[PDB]
């Protein structure tokens, strides 16, 4: 699903503990179609046209490394204020690498946060795992979430979320090769339905 032959996302979650998951991707399924495709041009405007913009990134390639994730987030938690707010990601590969993971939080197409982490490979069960667990969510997101959950209707959450996107670029720190680039877009789910996602391939 979300992965190349060089690097596969295994698990992704954003969550709060006093554990509630806002979003969750866990990664095998028989019959399962290939991923649908979205024209990358439809979303150039969700991220900045600057350097590290989607167009420029996609221009360098390779194109099979580019995915769109639509999240229907679950923002229904509490009996709250405080809590630990975290993001956990797990990647895996057959090759030994060091990773640079850049996340760019974007509001109306403008970058308001860039977070850069590094993770070195760890051998486990005959492959390399890259575990970036319990990374503290930046304060911008935490405040944003705190406000977003006060909104009295889900349609109003959706209207606010239509201007909020995240771009993640994962590169091979040594060679500077793009390994994975994921654009994320957001709506809200009900707590009854729970969080969901749909992964697409970006093409051009
Ligand atoms: C940390 O500060 C940035 C890490 C980048 C990924 C954040 C994604 C998680 C946000 C969940 C939002 C839920 C709906 C708006």
Swiss-Prot record:
Q: Where in the cell is it found?
A: Nucleus
Q: Region labeled Transcriptional activation — which residues?
A: 1-204
Q: Where is the signal peptide?
A: none
The lineage's top-level taxon is Eukaryota
How is this protein organized at the quaternary level? Interacts with YAP1 and WWTR1/TAZ.
| Physiological role | Transcription factor which plays a key role in the Hippo signaling pathway, a pathway involved in organ size control and tumor suppression by restricting proliferation and promoting apoptosis. The core of this pathway is composed of a kinase cascade wherein MST1/MST2, in complex with its regulatory protein SAV1, phosphorylates and activates LATS1/2 in complex with its regulatory protein MOB1, which in turn phosphorylates and inactivates YAP1 oncoprotein and WWTR1/TAZ.
Q: What is the protein name for this chain?
A: Transcriptional enhancer factor TEF-4
Source organism: Homo sapiens (Human)
Q: Which residues of the full protein are shown?
A: 222 to 446 of 447
